[PDB]
Amino acid sequence: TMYDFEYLNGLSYTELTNLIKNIKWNQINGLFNYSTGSQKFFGDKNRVQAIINALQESGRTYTANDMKGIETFTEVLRAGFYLGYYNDGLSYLNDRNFQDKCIPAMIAIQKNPNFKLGTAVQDEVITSLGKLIGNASANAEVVNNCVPVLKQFRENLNQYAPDYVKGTAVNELIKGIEFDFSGAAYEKDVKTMPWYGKIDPFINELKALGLYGNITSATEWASDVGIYYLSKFGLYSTNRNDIVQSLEKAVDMYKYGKIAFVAMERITWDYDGIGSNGKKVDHDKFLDDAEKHYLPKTYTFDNGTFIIRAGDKVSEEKIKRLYWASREVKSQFHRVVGNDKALEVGNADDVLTMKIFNSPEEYKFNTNINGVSTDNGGLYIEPRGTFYTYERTPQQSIFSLEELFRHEYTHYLQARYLVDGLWGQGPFYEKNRLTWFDEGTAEFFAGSTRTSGVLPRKLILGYLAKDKVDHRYSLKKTLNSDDSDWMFYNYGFAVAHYLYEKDMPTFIKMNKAILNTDVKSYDEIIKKLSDDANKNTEYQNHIQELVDKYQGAGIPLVSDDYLKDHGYKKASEVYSEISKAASLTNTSVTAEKSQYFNTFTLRGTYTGETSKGEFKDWDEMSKKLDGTLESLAKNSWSGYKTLTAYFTNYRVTSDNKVQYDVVFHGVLTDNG
């Protein structure tokens, strides 16, 4: 039941056409393939004509039960024109004049009483017709005959548009006609087409579909097709402004929904961005208004250097937590990195803007508004200082808003304080180096806590619960990556945590390398780690130790204690009490105004005893400082529970005394 061209070419036309009528197109071997047999088959102007005629007779007789092989009769012809496009010698099939020979057959299908939606056959006939037009020709007479089908589809819009078959049929029918028409007037004058100004009944049928109004989630696409192709076919309308008016009506009708954005795109691209009144439509303003609709609320923190623009449905509690969460990750990150001063002067990240949508659905419009992928839980655009996300439920996503935010916040920090230059575009990216690092350390810093350094996050330990066999990445494999499975980031984290807990010296040396822009240093470290097999066993067991921690693991989240009304504490007191408790010298402070509270940032020097070595110093400094935060929180002022602290710029005095710049940040309830 599988046929070759070298068999079909020997058959009579009468025999051939009859055969095609009762076989499927895929039964022909190499139909769309260019062969010596294919060239010979379609090279016969009479044979193709016989096929065209056989189609015409099939279209004149077909019923609801039998298709009379119209699908097969259309695909062979499609193969003909397709091969006539890409190969010389069949270039007569490329000429539209010959393609017009299909129109008499097309008309026959349309004049059949069975030319409507109904049974699977009837639907596939419209589909097959539509696909043919795209490769062949349409004139205007055939276009206008599609009206009763569009009317039929439109009249039962709420029943047919959710189905794939009928829906696909109408879409293919329109899409195909548009394809033929545009390609015909590619650079030619539009005013000189055989159909120009004659397809008004068809155009009007698209207005009706496009401007349907009463749409659901199931039928939105249908009116979308209506509007999109109202614009496209409207180019062949004797009235420009009439169409534009309908497109303007589409905007007003479905305001700040998919079809609004489509209609506005249609005005700017198809109609020079000129209104029906004849004045330039301000597309920017539309997007500006659309964003204000979805992000109506603003919350300003840190003297305006931390702005959350958010949907009307996102809780004010979350807004506050997200501020406080930023402050934890910040502190932990700064401890490990040892720099809090920004690398570049006058950047975007001087203001961190976060745009949070009400939900994933509403989130999608961001890509219309700000032109950034929205196929994600959230995204940090560095050149903009901007983090786009949406509030989510526990069902919509397994990460929550804060869990996600803590993760992405780290990317802002990495770009601002760690990687000199444009993030992803420096010497460190000339080769694949930081793939595990950037994504890995961020999964990791998301685990930040107020008084307990950085902890692992349950859910991630949850992933590592899988097959120990192979699968579990080696230290060599993790550091060096084009393709790698989703688990790559989970083992990337396993490294960052391994280094943190089991080997700080390395982890610190690594960050200093990035910080100082020393690729040579960084590579030497990655080489040492990958070449040493003992460091892999250290790592392999640590992954097991993380898998061991999962059962009783938590998710680091900002505490309810942050949101409490702490009450007035005098400013001068807080500073003194902190300065003494942390043995700080030469202190200065800045107060910053926020939306719901004020905050202070205390900057001091701490000089300790004699040095125990950089990395032992860091460990002790951490323990001493986390100790100072916990002791201050034993005080009666609830405010000390909002405190976060870090230390940077490690050095040693002429007399070998430990030295750090130390920073405290917390709530300020004193106004004066």
Phi, psi for residue 300 in degrees, rounded to 5: -110, 125
Rounded to a whole number of angstroms, the minimum distance from the CB of residue 409 to Zn ion is 9
Q: Which is nearer to Zn ion, 212 or 444 (CB)?
A: 444
Residue 671 CB neighbours (<10 A): 9
The C-alpha atoms of residue 635 and residue 632 are separated, in whole angstroms, by: 6
Maximum distance among all alpha carbons in the chain? 106
* Minimum distance from residue 403 beta carbon to Zn ion (Å): 12
CB of 273 to Zn ion, least distance (A): 37
| 419 annotated as belonging to a binding site for a ligand | yes
Note if 538 is an active site residue.
no
CA 110, 114, 120, 121 torsion-angle sign: negative
- Catalytic residue among 362, 408, 443, 620, which? 408
Report d(CA 230, CA 199) in Å as an integer. 11
Residue 415 annotated in ligand binding = yes
Cβ closer to Zn ion: 372 or 591? 372
Q: Please tell me the distance from the alpha carbon of residue 13 to that of residue 30, in angstroms, as a whole number.
A: 20
Contact 450, 559 (CB under 8 A): yes
Site for Zn ion in 440-459 (CB under 5 A): 442
Q: Are 66 and 124 in contact (CB under 8 A)?
A: no
Q: In 3-state terms, what secondary structure has residue 538? A: helix
Please classify residue 614 by burial: count the beta carbons closer than 10 Å to its beta carbon, then call 0-12 exposed, 13-18 middle and 19+ buried.
middle
> Does 407 count as an annotated binding residue?
yes
DSSP letters for 148-199 = HHHHHHHHTHHHHTTSHHHHHHHHHHHHHHHHHHHHHTSSS-GGG-TTTTT-
Q: Are 483 and 475 in contact (CB under 8 A)?
A: no
Rank residues 256 and 423 by Cβ distance to Zn ion and give the closer one: 423
Total site size for Zn ion, rule CB under 5 A = 1
Tell me if 371 is assigned to a ligand binding site.
Answer: no
Q: Which residues pair with 300 in a beta bridge?
A: 307
Which residue, 194 or 383, is less far from Zn ion as judged by CB? 383
Show Cβ contacts of residue 613 under 8 Å, excluding neighbours closer than 6 positions.
none
Q: Is 542 annotated as a binding residue?
A: no
Closest C-alpha to 135, from 84, 193, 70: 84
Nearer to Zn ion by Cβ, of 178 and 408: the residue is: 408
Residue 421 marked in a binding site: yes
Nearer to Zn ion, 299 or 387 (CB): 387
Q: How far is the CB of 440 from Zn ion (least distance, A)?
A: 9
As measured in angstroms, the least distance from the Cβ of 504 to Zn ion is 23
Q: Which residues contact 250 (CB under 8 A, 6 or more apart)?
A: 210, 211, 227, 230, 259, 260, 262, 263
Shortest separation between residue 401's beta carbon and Zn ion, angstroms: 15
Residues 414-443 that bind Zn ion (CB under 5 A): 442
Q: Is 382 annotated as a binding residue?
A: yes
Nearer to Zn ion, 442 or 454 (CB): 442
Minimum distance of Zn ion from residue 68's CB (angstroms): 58
Min separation Cβ 378 and Zn ion, Å: 9
Burial class (CB in 10 A: 0-12, 13-18, 19+), 65: exposed
* Half-sphere exposure of residue 70: CA atoms within 13 angstroms, side-chain side: 35
Please list every residue in the chain followed by a chain break, i.e. its C lies more than 2.5 Å from the next written N: 481
Three-point CA angle 480, 482, 483, nearest 5°:
100
Rg, Å, the chain Cα set: 34
Interface with Zn ion (CB under 5 A): 442
Residues forming the active site: 408
Q: Which residues participate in the annotated binding site? A: 382, 407, 411, 415, 419, 421, 439
